[PDB]
Write a protein that binds this ligand. Structure first.
Ligand SMILES: C=C1[C@H](COP(=O)(O)OP(=O)(O)OP(=O)(O)O)[C@@H](O)C[C@@H]1n1cnc2c(=O)nc(N)[nH]c21
Ligand SMILES: [Mg+2]
Lengths: 406, 553
DNA sequence: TCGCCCCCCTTCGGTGCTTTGCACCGAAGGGGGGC
């Protein structure tokens, strides 16, 4: 084969990101994986005269107990040329979110049969560390389409359509969406008749080279106001500040007549009887909260953002938007490990589920705003990561003023 | 001899040419020592004469060696380094003796003149051009270039490491049960072979290094304990640091104090309880390294405490993979922590300390979480796993923290251990307002241009107060308003502010702060019995908040 | 009058916020130690 010419974006240099420490089991796994890859010519040993580097680590899944090597090419992807500017990018199908059940398959290995442009390989270097720094790091670069590089699905694009044709041929209403190294494959078949055709796809994929998702239950959780029939000054203050915030999202919500029920310098536990003009305002704004907002539409030229709040008892609320206060989706993720004693696990799993939903719904992951200290996240997240992709994220520290989403 | 290893190609940064800088004066002893190496270097092909077509130049010097007889040559390549391509450094960290296992037979070897046995890219040599001056000006200099890795060049350490790795790998794969710690040219070689076969393996390794041009002189071939290694001393059953000598001085400069704190930090890996908070405070707000700084009374005490700790003999032990690692932390005060890592009681693998202040406002529970994180990372680096923790915090306390704090947080498997002072929450905010307690509506405003402001309150019991403030900010006046309400209320209070800022700081339950004003608020929160803290949006005419807002106006 | 790596402590400067200072963060200064 002859390679495709690839470029970084104008004025950008390749990645230069330090390797972080790894446990014994992950270092041994990487050493086993890479030496086999080196023997098959998929990677090459390089030295320190290549000035580029990207962190590497490994994950092992809940029901495939072999290690998967994972290279965090987030920085490399950010600097790589667009492939819709070369228009070899993949289109997202609006059918996938409508399906009964969607199974994720890791088809990363198909990339290893296509060589990478000789002049772009240096940008793909990574370094395996050493327990107790017994040796210097050991460095490799790829000779083929790397797992995790955004250009690999685009270059391999024309070929996956060829390998897929007979399947989508024979099953015209199964929908298959490539995202990075993953195939998202949905159908309306019964819970276990769907599974067997997933096995059929595996065999056709094998002839050359997670769990079941249910999009119907991805219930949206809207803003809700409490129901009491005794209401204190404090109850009405917390309700007025909550709707005042929601006035930035919705239209025609007002507070001045719930607002004057508290006129005067009152005690926070005094019980204010509700005006009929207050019940006028309240049952009114309840129903605006009841249905979605009008005028919010997805725009593919802009990025997706996701915000998460810890609510406790293992509940986690989230919003996905592109423009502030124009949420494309609000929701609530629920823990289920059973021990229910680990916030970092719950949050890491919530990020995977939210990002999964974005791929199914819009075709790409959002940039997360994570309610956690950077260094707490960094100490523990990889122990819980199970996806072959990694989303962009930043770290935020905003206390709740309102418990808007609860 | 020079290795027949292939050279690693090296480039200048794009656009740049090589250095062109004239040479300076050195002493007579320096010229003779340098000429002996220079004439010998040319004899062994380390350098070659050049002349005037080569337009580049760089200046040269020498420095004394810990082996007192020898002299070490260095050329000042600061300019060439600036123009040389970036390298990805492969030395990721420093091996630690607590990460060694017990070994039956141990050897330590050193490669002599290691840089000078690794050849340099042919096309790159012309940029290493230099001149040797002999005295002041009897002659000008003769010109040489390097055929090998020069000392002082940005790329030399990495091309030595890469070269050493290539030469060692055959021997490593052929003897998987021989530990080789490779740091620069220093080789630690341990094994569970009887001394007879062990020494067969060593000479076999040494003869492999010599074929590739790395000689190992007997002078630096250690074969009996105690081995000198990486600044430590390795015995069969234990290890020590080489002696740490602290400055003792009548009058201290900033630079002196900086050297002392560095020594103490080095000592902390094996001496438990070391503290540097009061000595480092003296470095703050200073302006010259030669400025004399008098020790405060607190810094004298802390110094004396450390000096008592250092007069005691200490040792670490080696790692037993068949046992768990255990990490215990104690609290020392003013944001300082110390820790020990061990496998059997009273037999420390190592110690250390954590004492960073992260943020302007924090509490002991956050900092304890940070110390845990530092220890977890350190254990991964040295042993490849995290330890089990023994922590002076009750499960009730931690559980109160991660349910009332809004950020995700965690600590791994840990056992409570009762070593006061315990880590505590110093107050908790009520989740509901308090019946019978007074209700304060607080607010403060400042004028951004003016820098003048007021803080005040109104209450459900009919109380009011306005205080003028000078040289303040918007955020300070809000903090001040909360200060006043805590000051004039009883042991139980309900407070309503319109400052998301102030609510945000206080809801995180801080117990220390870089701000004297926030610290004052903290002491008042600790003295209260119950406090409920509520927010409302400003300027929406809300009962209470609107009355005070107007009062502050 | 040198190079490369790790660590700590202090300082400084850039970024972003429904900001007008404030809090965060990384880099660069000093020190320790290694070869
Ligand atoms: C680690 C190093 C090798 C092994 O250091 P080394 O102690 O084993 O010295 P070397 O093998 O050369 O001589 P020896 O083993 O015969 O005694 C040396 O090549 C050079 C390098 N190094 C050490 N210190 C310095 C220094 O300050 N400035 C520079 N630029 N480089 C230095
Ligand atoms: Mg040597």
């Amino acid at each position: 084969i002859e390679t495709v010419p690839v470029k970084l974006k104008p004025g950008m240099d390749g990645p230069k990101v330090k390797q972080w420490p790894l446990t014994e089991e992950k270092i041994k796994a990487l050493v086993e994986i890479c030496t086999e890859m080196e023997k098959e010519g998929k990677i090459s040993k390089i030295g320190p005269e290549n000035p580029y580097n990207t962190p590497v680590f490994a994950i092992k899944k809940k029901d495939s107990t072999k290690w998967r090597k994972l290279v965090d090419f987030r920085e490399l992807n950010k600097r790589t040329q667009d492939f819709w500017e070369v228009q070899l990018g993949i289109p997202h199908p609006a059918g996938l979110k409508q399906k009964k059940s969607v199974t994720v398959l890791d088809v990363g290995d198909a990339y290893f049969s296509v060589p990478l442009d000789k002049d772009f390989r240096k940008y793909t270097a990574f370094t395996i560390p050493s327990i107790n720094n017994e040796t210097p790091g050991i460095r490799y670069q790829y000779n083929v389409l790397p797992q995790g590089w955004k250009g690999s699905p685009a270059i391999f694009q024309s070929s996956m359509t060829k390998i897929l044709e007979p399947f989508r041929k024979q099953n015209p209403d199964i929908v298959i969406y490539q995202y990075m190294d993953d195939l998202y494959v949905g159908s309306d078949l019964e819970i276990g008749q769907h599974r067997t055709k997933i096995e059929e796809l595996r065999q056709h994929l094998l002839r050359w080279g997670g769990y079941e998702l249910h999009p119907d239950k991805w219930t949206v959780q809207p803003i809700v106001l409490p129901e009491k029939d005794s209401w204190t000054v404090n109850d009405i203050q917390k309700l007025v500040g909550k709707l005042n915030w929601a006035s930035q999202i919705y239209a025609g919500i007002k507070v001045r007549q719930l607002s004057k029920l508290l006129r005067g310098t009152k005690a926070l536990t005094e019980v204010v009887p509700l005006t009929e003009e207050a019940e006028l305002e309240l049952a009114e704004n309840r129903e605006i909260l009841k249905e979605p907002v009008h005028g919010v539409y997805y725009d593919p030229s802009k990025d997706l953002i996701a915000e998460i709040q810890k609510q406790g008892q293992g509940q986690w609320t989230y919003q996905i938007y592109q423009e502030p206060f124009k949420n494309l989706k609000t929701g609530k993720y629920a823990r289920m490990k059973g021990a229910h004693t680990n916030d970092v696990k719950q949050l890491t799993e919530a990020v995977q589920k939210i990002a999964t939903e974005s791929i199914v719904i819009w075709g790409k992951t959002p940039k997360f705003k994570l309610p956690i200290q950077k260094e707490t996240w960094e100490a523990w997240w990889t122990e819980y990561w199970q996806a072959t992709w990694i989303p962009e994220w930043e770290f935020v520290n905003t206390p709740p003023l309102v418990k808007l989403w609860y | 001899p020079i290795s027949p290893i292939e050279t690693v190609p090296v480039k200048l940064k794009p656009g740049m040419d090589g250095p062109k800088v004239k040479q300076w004066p050195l002493t007579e002893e320096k010229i003779k020592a340098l000429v002996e190496i220079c004439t010998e270097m040319e004899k062994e092909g380390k350098i070659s004469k050049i002349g005037p077509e080569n337009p580049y130049n760089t200046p040269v010097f020498a420095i004394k060696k810990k082996d007192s007889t020898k002299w070490r040559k260095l050329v000042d390549f600061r300019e060439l380094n600036k123009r040389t391509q970036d390298f990805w450094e492969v030395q990721l960290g420093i091996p630690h003796p607590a990460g060694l296992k017990q070994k039956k037979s141990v050897t330590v070897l050193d490669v002599s003149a290691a840089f000078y046995s690794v050849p340099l890219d042919k096309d790159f040599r012309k940029y290493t051009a230099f001149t040797i001056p002999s005295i002041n000006n009897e002659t000008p200099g003769i010109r040489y270039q390097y055929n090998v890795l020069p000392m002082g060049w940005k790329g030399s350490p990495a091309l030595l490491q890469s070269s050493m790795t290539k030469i060692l790998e055959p021997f490593r794969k052929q003897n998987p049960d021989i530990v080789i710690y490779q740091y620069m040219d220093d080789l630690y070689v341990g094994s569970d072979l009887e001394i007879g076969q062990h020494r067969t393996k060593i000479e076999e390794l040494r003869q492999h290094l010599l074929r590739w041009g790395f000689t190992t002189p007997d002078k630096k071939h250690q074969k009996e304990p105690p081995f000198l290694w990486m600044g430590y001393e390795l015995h069969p059953d234990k290890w020590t640091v080489q002696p740490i000598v602290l400055p003792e001085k009548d009058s201290w400069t900033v630079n002196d104090i900086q050297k002392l704190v560095g020594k103490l930090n080095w000592a902390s890996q094996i001496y438990a309880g070391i503290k540097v908070r009061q000595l480092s405070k003296l470095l703050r707000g200073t302006k010259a390294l030669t400025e004399v700084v008098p020790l405060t009374e607190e810094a004298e005490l802390e110094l004396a405490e450390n000096r008592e700790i250092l007069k005691e003999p200490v040792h670490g032990v080696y790692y037993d993979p068949s046992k768990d690692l255990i990490a215990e932390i104690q609290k020392q005060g003013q944001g300082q922590w110390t820790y020990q890592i061990y496998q059997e009681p009273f037999k420390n693998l190592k110690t250390g300390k954590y004492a960073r202040m992260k943020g302007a406002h924090t509490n002991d529970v956050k900092q304890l979480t940070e110390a845990v994180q530092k220890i977890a990372t350190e254990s991964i680096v040295i042993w490849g796993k995290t330890p089990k923790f023994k922590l002076p915090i009750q499960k009730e306390t931690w559980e109160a923290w991660w349910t009332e704090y809004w950020q995700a947080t965690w600590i791994p498997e840990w056992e409570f251990v009762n070593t006061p002072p315990l880590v505590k929450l110093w107050y908790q905010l009520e989740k509901e307002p308090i019946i019978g307690a007074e209700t304060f509506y607080v607010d403060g405003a400042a004028n951004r241009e003016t820098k003048l402001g007021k803080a005040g309150y109104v209450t459900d019991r009919g109380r009011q107060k306005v205080v003028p403030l000078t040289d303040t900010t918007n955020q300070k006046t809000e903090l001040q308003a909360i200060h006043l309400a805590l000051q004039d209320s009883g042991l139980e209070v309900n407070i309503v502010t319109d400052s998301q800022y102030a609510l945000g700081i206080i809801q995180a339950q801080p117990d220390k702060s870089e701000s004297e004003l926030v610290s004052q608020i903290i002491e008042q929160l600790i003295k209260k019995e119950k406090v409920y803290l509520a927010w409302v949006p400003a300027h929406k005419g809300i009962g209470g908040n609107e009355q005070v807002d107007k009062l502050v106006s």
